[PDB]
RNA sequence: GGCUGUCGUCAGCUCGUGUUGUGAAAUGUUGGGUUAAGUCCCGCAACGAGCGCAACCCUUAUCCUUUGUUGCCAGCGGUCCGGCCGGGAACUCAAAGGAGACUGCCAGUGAUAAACUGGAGGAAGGUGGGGAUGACGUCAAGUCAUCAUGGCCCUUACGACCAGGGCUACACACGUGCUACAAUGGCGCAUACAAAGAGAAGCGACCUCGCGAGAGCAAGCGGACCUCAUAAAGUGCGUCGUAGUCCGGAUUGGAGUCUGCAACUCGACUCCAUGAAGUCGGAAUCGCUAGUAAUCGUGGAUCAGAAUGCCACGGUGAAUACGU
């Protein structure tokens, strides 16, 4: 807002900014504190192992909705649930959001 | 009204006419088949020109001294799309997007202290 | 009405060019009004002798030098036939600014 | 250092700079040969140092009759080693 | 060796000048001489003033020398009696009175001068140089200046071989004019050949 | 590839049918230059008659005999890799790859204008001169020479 | 030491953390497209960063803010018909600052993505056209003969001043460019044909002769004001129709002009004589990507003086790039 915008530049300012966007738009979330998550929600186990995997490394607990044809070894909250049916995951992923949302008391 | 305009290409000074009737053609004291009809420069000096309104068509007394050939050619086509705004005062952007007075590339581009050619290996390939 | 962007180039230049500029320009018939008492003004190109880190000294050239009054109204042939033929005033530039 | 040693150009067109500027309007008739001078005119063969004739291109850095601009005694092969100095108007390298 | 000097490529940067102005086209080979001669003879018999940096500068006709030291001690001397008796040596080969100027600088860390100064004075005390040059390196990256490079030649011992080594830490944008890197090459004259030591500082931005 | 194509179909002249002369500057169309050969062909052959000694009638096309190649360079993927090959000329390319190759070199070889370059050159032809004859001696290198590999 | 050539304006060289492996190590930087590309984006156990590239630097492709002296002379007075004076600074030209090209947009190909393509917008379509920017390295590369520089000699000296020559001499060969080998040219006639530059120790306006060289006279300027400077290949006019040629100009004298005290070896330039080899060049080979080749000259720096070298400017002006 001080410097970017009409300080030194526009044209070379305007390039910065538009490839700057897409950095600005990744890790909405993320990077508004600290970090150093105590649980994750991961919505599938063999297509996201990796996270699993770094959780499992660093002993933080995964409340992932395991996949039937995944590996649950990693998961120590595995739920034999489903990753079809977009409806389905969308009514889990309401009921966690409510119930987190009134589990403060 | 009298149409007057200098024009130029690469530093040229012309002195362009352009008012109805007027048959003879003085173009720096030439002649009309000296240097746009049945000789070398019958057309490529015109061709520009044969956009825009027929050279016989208006009067032309044009004492160009500047340019080449095709110089003076861009020379007389810059003088006479801005010598006739006041027959139409609507041209600086009509003719501004048609493509007509601008600096056309078909010339030696302009070079800060450059090579011979100032794009490419002068006549001396041996290194 | 009459401003002038004086380009400034050395001092032996500029102690004759400060007059010698239109002195040539007047000798009966020009409108000129003359000399004017023209107090100290530091006028040259857009270039600082020495920027630092001190954005107040703002080190520049200095030169005398007057800017061009000509203002004409009706020269004669004979009075302006050597308005620009001057054997002296090395730096000459009458950039008139409307 | 070796800049006096190599000066030889430096004290041989110096003298006459202004020694004939506001002379030849004045005495062009001296100046010009109003033919033949040819025992004034060979008084420049008393001094056998120092003369307009013996202009070789003055360089203290290396002494060598190379590398001189009347402009602005500017390099002009030194440049290979000093191009980023912009000391380099009208004359530059050939690459372009 | 295709590297250039940043100095000479900050010509047209707000930094200080060497030998620059616009004068008339007959006063050129006086003005370089007297130039020359200033330069030369004003930093000789400075050896033990350790003096920060001086320039001098003619713009037109004019000489408007600048004088930063570094430690006051090592430069006060006798009470100022040798810098009274420079600035009168400096006036009578100029012929003017030249405004001289002092200006007091301090913290001996970011200074590529005194760090090069030091690091030839430890090499030539037959010590080790990696730990003094790591060590130069952490306490200029301590005091700011957050980009920092340092060179040294070989002929180390008495063998004839050389080698060059960087143990660059930062950033040291030298192709961007717009970084305002400092440098001093520095040498010294060891019991086996003479040691070079290079040392560039990134000391922020405009 | 299975199945090739032939020339794609194209207009006579109505004026005389030359195909060569349409063929000489239509390939060399740049800047809109149509008009300006279509403007000096008919100027330089009405003065040609005295210029040069012999109208531009009959005496236009007796010089180019040796012009009609009988084998040509084609790239033919063959063993692994390109090779010429040559076989019979193929009207495809018998007279057209000839043909684009004439004012390759007769383009601006000494005047400032393509007035005269284009007749003139050609007309040439009739004095042991021009450049479109020679043009033939390159391509034997490669044709009749290595039979043994071709 | 510093600098340069070399791969090489090549797309490159590494690191921090993380991950895989007992480990050396690998990934990042292996893939797709842009492709000029570690530029960019996508996918991806990788994420980011430090150097290189791109743009950030200069010029140019349009217009605008500001502006007219000498330069242009739109309009006004005649025209000292060249626009000369005022005058307009519309405006050619010029600059103190900007925008305009930035995948910006329509549609399609393409994994929807990236990217590409067809189209449109605009002077400028996929860095709009050129440059400054040469990494880790690299070769005992070259440079101590540009300078400095460790070691190796000596200072009545392998130190030097002066006076002739030599780097251009020949017995030949090689590398480069120029001249040509012409009639796409040569002759004289009319004809409008540039710019960047350079210059009070200078060009030398003009005036007279020299076939000319240049000399006797000479304003001008501290240079948008005075000179180089007129342009050339070109066209119409008569010419030879390929003539060892009016081509080509070396080449062996004279008459001579200037630079320089003095120029055969080692100055330039002009006229007469010189009309040779060479009539497109084998084995072959090299340079060429749009103003490209191809050319035509113009000058500037170097200049006591001595370009076919080098630098710089214009005049014109095509095809080949399907393809790995």
């Known amino acids: ?105 | 009204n009298q149409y007057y305009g200098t024009g130029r290409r690469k530093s040229s000074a012309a002195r362009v006419f352009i008012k109805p009737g007027n048959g003879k053609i003085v173009i720096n004291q030439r002649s009309l088949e000296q240097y746009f009809g049945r000789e070398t420069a019958r057309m490529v000096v015109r061709q520009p020109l044969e956009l825009v309104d027929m050279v016989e068509k208006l009067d032309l007394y044009i004492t160009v001294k500047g340019g080449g050939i095709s110089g003076q050619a861009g020379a007389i086509r810059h003088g006479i799309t801005r010598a006739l705004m006041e027959y139409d005062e609507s041209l600086r952007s009509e003719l501004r997007k048609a493509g007509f007075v601008t600096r056309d590339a078909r010339q030696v581009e302009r070079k800060k202290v450059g090579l011979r050619k100032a794009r490419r290996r002068p006549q001396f390939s041996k290194r | 009405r009459i401003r002038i962007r004086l380009k400034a180039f050395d001092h032996r230049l500029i102690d004759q060019a400060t007059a010698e500029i239109v002195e040539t320009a007047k000798r009966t018939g020009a409108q000129v009004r003359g000399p004017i008492p023209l107090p100290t003004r530091k006028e040259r190109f857009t270039v600082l002798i020495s920027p630092h880190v001190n954005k107040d000294a703002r080190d520049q050239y200095e030169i005398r030098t007057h800017l061009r009054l000509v203002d004409i109204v009706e020269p004669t042939e004979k009075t302006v036939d050597a308005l620009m033929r001057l054997d002296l005033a090395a730096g000459v530039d009458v950039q008139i600014s409307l | 250092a070796k800049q006096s040693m190599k000066a030889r150009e430096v004290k041989r067109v110096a003298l006459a700079d202004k020694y004939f500027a506001k002379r030849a309007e004045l005495k062009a008739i001296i100046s010009d040969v109003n033919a033949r001078w040819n025992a004034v005119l060979k008084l420049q063969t008393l001094p056998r140092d120092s003369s307009p004739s013996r202009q070789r291109n003055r360089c203290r850095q290396t002494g060598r009759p190379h590398g001189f601009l009347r402009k602005f005694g500017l390099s002009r092969i030194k440049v290979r080693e000093a191009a980023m100095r912009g000391e380099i108007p009208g004359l530059k390298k050939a690459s372009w | 060796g295709q590297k250039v000097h940043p100095n000479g490529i900050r010509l047209g940067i707000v930094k200080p000048w060497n030998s620059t102005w616009f004068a008339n086209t007959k006063e050129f080979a006086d003005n370089l001489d007297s130039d020359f001669k200033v330069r030369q003879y004003l930093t000789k018999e400075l050896a033990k003033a350790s003096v920060s940096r001086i320039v001098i500068e003619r713009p037109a006709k004019s000489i408007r020398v600048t004088i930063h030291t570094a430690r006051p001690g090592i430069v006060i001397g006798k009470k100022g009696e040798d810098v009274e008796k420079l600035r009168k040596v400096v006036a009578d080969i100029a012929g003017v009175p030249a405004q001289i100027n002092i200006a007091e600088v301090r913290k001996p860390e970011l200074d590529a001068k005194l760090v090069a100064d030091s690091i030839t004075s430890q090499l030539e005390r037959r010590v080790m140089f990696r730990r003094a040059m790591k060590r130069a390196v952490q306490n200029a990256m301590r005091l700011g200046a957050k980009g920092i490079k340092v060179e040294v030649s070989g002929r180390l011992g008495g063998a004839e071989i050389a080698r060059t080594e960087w143990y660059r830490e930062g950033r040291v944008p030298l192709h961007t004019l717009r970084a305002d890197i400092d440098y001093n090459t520095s040498e010294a004259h060891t019991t086996y050949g003479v040691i070079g030591v290079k040392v560039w500082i990134f000391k922020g931005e405009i | 590839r299975r199945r090739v194509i032939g020339q794609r179909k194209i207009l006579p002249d109505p004026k005389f049918g030359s195909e060569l002369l349409a063929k000489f500057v239509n390939i060399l169309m740049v800047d809109g230059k149509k008009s300006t050969a279509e403007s000096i062909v008919y100027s330089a052959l009405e003065t040609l008659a005295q210029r040069s000694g012999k109208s531009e009638l009959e005496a236009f096309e007796v010089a180019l005999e040796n012009v009609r190649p009988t084998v040509e360079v084609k790239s033919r993927r063959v063993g692994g890799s390109t090779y010429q090959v040559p076989v019979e000329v193929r009207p495809v390319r018998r007279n057209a790859l000839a043909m684009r190759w004439i004012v390759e070199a007769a383009r601006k070889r000494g005047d400032k204008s393509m007035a005269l370059r284009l007749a003139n050159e050609l007309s040439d032809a009739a004095e042991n001169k021009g450049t479109a004859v020679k043009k033939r001696e390159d391509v034997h290198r490669m044709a009749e020479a290595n039979k043994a590999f071709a």
Do not use: C, W
């Not at chain 1, 807002?1 to 530049?9: P, R, S």
């Not at chain 1, 390039?15 to 929600?41: C, H, V, W």
């Not at chain 1, 309401?94 to 009134?102: K, L």
């Open chain 1, 1 to 105: 807002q001080d410097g970017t915008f009409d300080k030194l530049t526009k044209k070379e300012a305007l390039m910065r900014t538009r490839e700057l966007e897409k950095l600005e738009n990744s890790l909405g979330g993320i990077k508004d504190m600290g970090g150093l998550p105590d649980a994750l929600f991961v919505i599938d186990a063999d297509h996201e192992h990796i996270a699993i995997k770094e959780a499992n490394n660093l002993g933080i607990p995964v409340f992932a909705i395991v996949d039937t044809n995944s590996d649950p070894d990693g998961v120590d909250f595995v739920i034999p649930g489903n990753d079809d049916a977009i409806r389905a995951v969308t009514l889990y992923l309401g009921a966690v959001a409510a119930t987190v949302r009134e589990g403060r008391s």
